């Protein structure tokens, strides 16, 4: 029977802290800082390079902008359709949300990577011609919105 004096974490989980500056057997008199200098008294930044114009100040900037009004779509591929719809049939945004292939506030797109032999009445926002054709071949309804 278990008690509280019969619990023990797994081997290798817990580990001994380095207590540094309490002995000249483990780490003493320098604590892994070496000897005198800026990296001994205090520390040093990461974005300083001696005095020469750093990489983040002598390379060009990347070109262009973002178009804040971009519409990123969230994709689904036909492979996962065939892998989570054996019976085939109607497939909407919520049918996809059920199987857990896209997010909840999704704005969806459809793409023809994987094989398609099941029959599916897919509903999405926008498709690709490969899905148009693949649904045309597996005999299904690619009735977009």
């Amino acid at each position: 029977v278990i008690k509280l004096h019969d619990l023990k974490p797994a081997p290798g989980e817990k580990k001994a802290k380095t207590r540094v500056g309490r002995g000249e057997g483990s780490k003493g008199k320098t604590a892994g800082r070496g000897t005198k200098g800026t990296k001994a008294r205090k520390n040093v930044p990461v974005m300083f390079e001696g005095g020469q114009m750093p990489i983040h100040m002598r390379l060009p900037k990347l070109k262009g902008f973002k178009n804040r009004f971009r519409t990123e779509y969230q994709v689904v591929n036909v492979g996962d359709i065939n892998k989570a719809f054996p019976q085939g049939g109607t497939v909407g945004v919520d049918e996809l949300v059920a199987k857990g292939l896209v997010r909840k506030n999704s704005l969806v797109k459809v793409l023809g990577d994987g094989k398609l032999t099941v029959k599916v009445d897919v509903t999405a926002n926008k498709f690709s011609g490969s899905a148009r054709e693949a649904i045309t071949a597996a005999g299904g309804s690619a009735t977009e919105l």
Partner: protein, 63 residues
């Protein structure tokens, strides 16, 4: 608090699918009057970052 990001390292450094780091190349803006086109042509595109500065650039980008 949070770890704030570096503006320059975000504006002159991106990441691809497999985690590579990418930059552009130098001596492209001005004084093109005398630079031959092949020299103007290997400087286009992007280029993968070196090894030696990958770590520094990780530390700048992330926090």
């Amino acid at each position: 608090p949070k770890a704030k990001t570096h503006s320059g390292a975000s504006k002159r450094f991106r990441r691809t699918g497999t985690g590579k780091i990418v930059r552009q190349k130098a001596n492209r803006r001005h004084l093109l009057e005398h630079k031959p086109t092949k020299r103007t042509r290997r400087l286009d595109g992007r280029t993968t970052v070196s090894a030696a500065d990958n770590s520094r650039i990780n530390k700048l980008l992330n926090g």
